[PDB]
Amino acid sequence: GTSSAFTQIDNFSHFYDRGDHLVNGKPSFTVDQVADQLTRSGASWHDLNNDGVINLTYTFLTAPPVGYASRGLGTFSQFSALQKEQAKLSLESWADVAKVTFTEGPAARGDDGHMTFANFSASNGGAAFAYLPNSSRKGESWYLINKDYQVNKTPGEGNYGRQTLTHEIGHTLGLSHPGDYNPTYRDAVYAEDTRAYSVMSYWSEKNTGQVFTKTGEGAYASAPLLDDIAAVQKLYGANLETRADDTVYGFNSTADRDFYSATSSTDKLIFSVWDGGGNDTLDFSGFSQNQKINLTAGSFSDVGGMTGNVSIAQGVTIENAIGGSGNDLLIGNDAANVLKGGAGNDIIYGGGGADVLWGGTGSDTFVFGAVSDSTPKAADIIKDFQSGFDKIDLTAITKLGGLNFVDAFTGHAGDAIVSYHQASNAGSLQVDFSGQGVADFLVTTVGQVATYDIVA
Ligand SMILES: [Ca+2]
Ligand SMILES: [Ca+2]
Ligand SMILES: [Ca+2]
Ligand SMILES: [Ca+2]
Ligand SMILES: [Ca+2]
Ligand SMILES: [Ca+2]
Ligand SMILES: [Ca+2]
Ligand SMILES: [Ca+2]
Ligand SMILES: [Zn+2]
CATH class of the missing domain: 3.40.390.10 (Collagenase (Catalytic Domain))
Known part of the structure; x- marks a missing residue:
């Protein structure tokens, strides 16, 4: 499970x-x-x-x-x-x-x-x-x-x-x-x-x-x-040729289209995103309702207290997403994404590629569904990790089997190492899922990570 x-x-x-x-x-x-x-x-x-x-x-x-x-x-x-x-x-x-x-x-x-x-x-x-x-x-x-x-x-x-x-x-x-x-x-x-x-x-x-x-x-x-x-x-x-450079949709919108613009927490947005390239963001920071944002091409999102009202068009790649002050879910795609939770207790799933994750205030959960999600050569970064409040969930990989926290890989599957570098305030999590004696999973963080902040 x-x-x-x-x-x-x-x-x-x-x-x-x-x-x-x-x-x-x-x-x-x-x-x-x-x-x-x-x-x-x-x-x-x-x-x-x-x-x-x-x-x-x-x-x-x-x-x-x-x-x-x-x-x-x-x-x-x-x-x-x-x-x-x-x-x-x-x-x-x-x-x-x-x-x-x-x-x-x-x-x-x-x-x-x-x-x-x-x-x-x-x-x-x-x-x-x-x-x-x-x-x-x-x-x-x-x-x-x-x-x-x-x-x-x-x-x-x-x-x-x-x-x-x-x-x-x-x-x-x-x-x-x-x-x-x-x-x-x-x-x-x-x-x-x-x-x-x-x-x-x-x-x-x-x-x-x-x-x-x-x-x-x-x-x-x-x-x-x-x-x-x-x-x-x-x-x-x-x-x-339409909006082929960096674009922001929703709050602080730069799309210059009335129907892609939000200026109030009461706004009712109902649109499908069409974009031509660049590093794009779906900013829904102004809403207080729990939201569910999916950056997958052709997928639907529940925005501003509504459900299934926002989507991304087929063949479009949006890179970033900003949640509101409610408890939201954020799902990235295969591209490197910047996912911001905002206030509240959010669940953030990076996906493939090295991702930049921001929990915000509240107890947040950074979820990983596969090993290819955060590798040593393309690891995610949690910029605001708060030990004893936030968590790193690997439950979908370990299927609840637990990890064996050690200081050095022994060559056994399930070995995990949590390190901290008090000088740069940088922390990390390594694990040997395959059991090859080296790490095949890496997650870097700005903020000390402890053994208890990991769910597996
Ligand atoms: Ca013609
Ligand atoms: Ca764009
Ligand atoms: Ca893009
Ligand atoms: Ca939030
Ligand atoms: Ca991703
Ligand atoms: Ca947090
Ligand atoms: Ca949060
Ligand atoms: Ca990732
Ligand atoms: Zn008609």
Whole structure:
């Protein structure tokens, strides 16, 4: 067996596993499988000028097009400045992940296509609608506005007015709904068909167990989520030029995107991280709720008192993570990561590569699941180890067999050596798991480590 600390880590890393199993009686689909499902119509824009990207233009209509009255949409009206500002933010988030550009202007000669945005007042027209890129109205999207329906009048980060724009633009890009779909999630074709995985879904995250808000309140992702991202990149290619240098997401964010920014402990973040390279950090230092942060590509995290609301896109490598003042879990990846616990009692799992770990205040547990996690040639470093408070857990390696603390390796498996260098305040832990008479596991610390601070 293992310790509770390790079990909590292993559980969270598998908590959102997708594929090859039944969930809610429906098949669980992987991100790749969903990317195919959302693009099953075959409709897309084309690179007419062959420059390796889809360059599109758009116009905020100022007057009803020819044949407009035959649509039955009622009174025509131009987008307001608010809508124009939000539409641009929606277009931008799509342009960040896929090789597509959107430039305001009239249909031009070298464009691969043209888009249009406008409003109507006749409810019969629905809350909003768009057309696929292979239709005769390719590029068009329409939004309802009247006394009885006002959500499109004040679109804004986090509200349905903004996700609507992002959703309709999705359609114009060639994305379909997760299913053909009175309809309910029961009619879904796969399990992850909820707004927790894709803004194209009609169902709430509640169907899959996630928790974003309370009744009476609304909370919707403003930008393309995990599956949406995969879907569009599969169509137009991933944009690696986006934020290719060091980036911070969340608190103290440097991503310059409203939906990746947190300035209050009450903020509700719902996003999927797309990044192009560099040493990146997920800073969630401003929240007081227990969190669970996973730096694995394509994985989900429970951020700011919510669950399954944050994720990293497939093919993205994020290097660092900062917990809040609650008791959190932090899981790194194969890269060298800087993992910060913050206040509270945290459990930190470095993974592969030499990692830098910071417990913070509170009793913290640095967990190791394999020997390859902290080797002599690539050992982790605990910068703030507090003897008699913190612990080093090797329970997943020793499986509770214990260690034999000695001063020098005798050539027996399980021999462990805890040393301290009172001059540099540096401590270390060595062990001979294989029993070859030399160390095959090393953990360096800034702060004296004792024999009792080790759990095995
Ligand atoms: Ca082009
Ligand atoms: Ca970056
Ligand atoms: Ca990176
Ligand atoms: Ca913490
Ligand atoms: Ca690591
Ligand atoms: Ca600590
Ligand atoms: Ca801590
Ligand atoms: Ca490691
Ligand atoms: Zn739709």
